[model samples]
Target: TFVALYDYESRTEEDLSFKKGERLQIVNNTEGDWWLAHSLTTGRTGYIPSNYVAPS
Candidate 1:
């Protein structure tokens, strides 16, 4: 995806939580900070604070 889910100012390749070569995709939704999600590493899915995350 060309867009970022989170706004990272530095264009440096290393300064990224999700990278260019990742397998997962951050789907773009417009409901605005009201979605349910959990960590994939621990298979932890739940309602994450959308205030902390955004689709930029």
Candidate 2:
């Protein structure tokens, strides 16, 4: 599990929009800079940048 450190908006099809303090499930960390995550708040899945989130 990981917690969002800041608010983020997705501008792409593979990414997700999230607010600060939202906990996400780590799905795929295959990419170095971007990783895939499942949102607990909305049950949506998309890619998230690694820098904006940290392990909870």
Candidate 3:
């Protein structure tokens, strides 16, 4: 699990949009800079910036 450090607006279907203070379940982090996660609030899954979140 991870916590969003900053609010983010997704620009595409592949991106995960979330607000600061939100918690997201980490799904994958195989690549650099970005990671795949699942939103508990929206029940959606997509990629979010690695810098925008931290381990919870």
Candidate 4:
């Protein structure tokens, strides 16, 4: 299920950038601080900070 939020500019390919309110699919989030997600808007996948998103 899609379960994270990201709204920032990606500095590199390793990062994901999207608009505010965009929902992303959670790929891997085993760690406490960072998570891997796929953007539904851009069809890009990358790492996002856990603190930037709220569980839904």
Q: Order of all candidates by TM-score, from best down to worst?
A: 2, 3, 4, 1
Tens digit of per-residue lDDT, candidate 1, span 1-56? 12224432333432224322222223333545533443333332333334345443
lDDT of 4 by residue, 18-56 (tens): 676777878898865667888776788887776666655
RMSD of each: 9.5, 0.9, 1.0, 2.4
Clashing residue pairs in candidate 2 are none
Sorted on lDDT, best first, the list reads 3, 2, 4, 1
Best by TM-score: 2
Q: lDDT by residue for model 3 over 1-56, one digit each (tens)? A: 88899999998889999999888998888887889999876888999999998888
Clashing residue pairs for model 3: none
C-alpha displacement of 33 in model 3, angstroms? 1.5
Q: List ranges where model 3 is wrong by over 4 Å.
A: none
Error of 1 at 47 (Å): 0.4
- Output candidate 4 Cα RMSD: 2.4
lDDT of 2 by residue, 1-56 (tens): 98899999998988988999999998988767888999887888999998998888
